[PDB]
Amino acid sequence: AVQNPENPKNKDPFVFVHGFTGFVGEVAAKGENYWGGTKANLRNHLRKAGYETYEASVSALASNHERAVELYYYLKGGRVDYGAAHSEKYGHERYGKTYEGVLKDWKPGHPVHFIGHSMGGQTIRLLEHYLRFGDKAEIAYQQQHGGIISELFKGGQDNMVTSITTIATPHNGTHASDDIGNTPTIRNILYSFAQMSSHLGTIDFGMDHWGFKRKDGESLTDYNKRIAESKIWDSEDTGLYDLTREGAEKINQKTELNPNIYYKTYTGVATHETQLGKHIADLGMEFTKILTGNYIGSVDDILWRPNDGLVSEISSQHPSDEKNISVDENSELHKGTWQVMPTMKGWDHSDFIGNDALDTKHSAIELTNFYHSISDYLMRIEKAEST
């Protein structure tokens, strides 16, 4: 229930960015709570503690490009514009929903702390890229064809993000997608259920820009014809591809460190070495992640075996080919470098957000103390920057 504070302890709002298959606010169901699960309401807790926070609402299955744009408009407000060139290339709708805007004042000089979990960490990085450099393809497209271009793709918009803090983010992708998720058979099943769900207006998987909604005065025949011919089934413009090792690396090659931003990663492991060097899921591993945790533990790439049930340790620690440094909670602050936090033994992909109801070992006060620590770290940054 609780509103943001009149007089907040932080001058830069904490913006939380959920991950793949994540739903927050009024696209969520009955009583599902992404940030906290059944164990805690982290929005209520942080705001009662005096902080100004927001939980961004972006597509569950869409690409990081889609989601990074949606994040911009979630904060700044307006009609989502995915880009004329990008949308033409991948063969989908250019315009999405329209958000009201929770921080219309968001501009250079009045920045934000971006905390992301899982795929949200990729989405944040991709947004900061478009803010700073824009997108050269979009500028070239509107130079060539005219029309309007989004402020976001124009670029030259710095000093809008203070810190980027990722939690169990597959910066380097995950075998879970390579070998399972983005397989033609699984992704067919998923996108088919999402289209059926969109058509029935039952659940918004954030993929309506692919034509899942049925147009006006359209026979069912035409509708089934458009969907069958949609470029979605083969497209690289999906979240599942961006969670692939190859697709994550495509993003890694786009992004570069901003010397004025504070970066930090939080990584979990919930597997243990066994016979032959294989890894198997700890007792307490979240139910739905047991299978993927076990698969990742047995892959050929030996260093990728330790994992949180979805993301390998070395994937979460930092993006490859980007400067990093080992620190802990008492280390001094560093700008422009990925501050790699010690691996948290016993924490799985879901535990980080309290979404493991069966795991009694992870209490509500432990989860609350973890986000306290993060926010204290963000207040250290604000203190260090003012002076």
Strand 53-56 and strand 324-326: pairing? unpaired
234: its two tokens: 């083969």
Stretch that binds Ca ion, among 207-215, 279-287, 318-326, 366-374 (CB under 5 A): 279-287
Question: Cβ 359 to Ca ion, closest distance in Å?
Answer: 4
The number of residues that bind Ca ion (CB under 5 A) is 6
Closer by beta carbon to Ca ion, 32 or else 88: 32
340: its two tokens: 């790699």
Closer by beta carbon to Zn ion, 237 or else 348: 237
Three-class SS state of 382: helix
378: its two tokens: 């963000």
Catalytic residue list contains 298: no
Q: Contacting Ca ion (CB under 5 A), which of 46, 71, 351, 353?
A: 351
Q: Contacting Zn ion (CB under 5 A), which of 12, 55, 81, 237?
A: 237
Distance in angstroms (rounded) separating the CA atoms of residues 107 and 92: 29
Contact present, 80 and 108 (Cβ < 8 Å): no
Closer by beta carbon to Zn ion, 96 or else 181: 96
What does the per-residue mask of binding to Ca ion show for 230-269, with x meaning CB under 5 A?
----------------------------------------
Closer by beta carbon to Zn ion, 237 or else 308: 237
What does the per-residue mask of binding to Ca ion show for 282-321, with x meaning CB under 5 A?
--x-x-----------------------------------
Q: Which does 348 bind (CB under 5 to 8 A by kind): Ca ion, Zn ion, none?
A: Ca ion
In the annotated binding site, the residues are 284, 348, 351, 356, 359
Give the active site residue among 59, 349, 350, 375: 349
Catalytic residue list contains 308: yes
271-to-181, 304, 349, 366 alpha-carbon distances in Å:
20, 12, 12, 20
Residues 6 or more apart from 286 whose CB is under 8 A from it?
A: 309, 348, 349, 350, 351, 355, 356, 358, 359
- Please report, as a single letter, which amino acid is at residue 211: G
Distance in angstroms (rounded) separating the CA atoms of residues 46 and 318: 26
Give the active site residue among 150, 171, 308, 362: 308
- Does 242 participate in binding Zn ion (rule CB under 5 A)? no
What does the per-residue mask of binding to Ca ion show for 330-349, with x meaning CB under 5 A?
------------------x-
Residues 6 or more apart from 275 whose CB is under 8 A from it?
A: none
Distance in angstroms (rounded) separating the CA atoms of residues 295 and 151: 43
Question: Cβ 82 to Zn ion, closest distance in Å?
Answer: 5
Question: Cβ 74 to Ca ion, closest distance in Å?
Answer: 29
Distance in angstroms (rounded) separating the CA atoms of residues 88 and 267: 37
Residues 6 or more apart from 200 whose CB is under 8 A from it?
A: none
Q: What are phi and psi of 6, to 5 degrees?
A: -60, -50
Q: Which does 359 bind (CB under 5 to 8 A by kind): Zn ion, Ca ion, none?
A: Ca ion
Catalytic residue list contains 373: no
Distance in angstroms (rounded) separating the CA atoms of residues 241 and 162: 28
Q: Which residues are catalytic?
A: 118, 308, 349
**Which residues here bind Ca ion, judged by CB under 5 A?**
284, 286, 348, 351, 356, 359
Q: Which residues bind Zn ion (CB under 5 A)?
A: 66, 90, 237
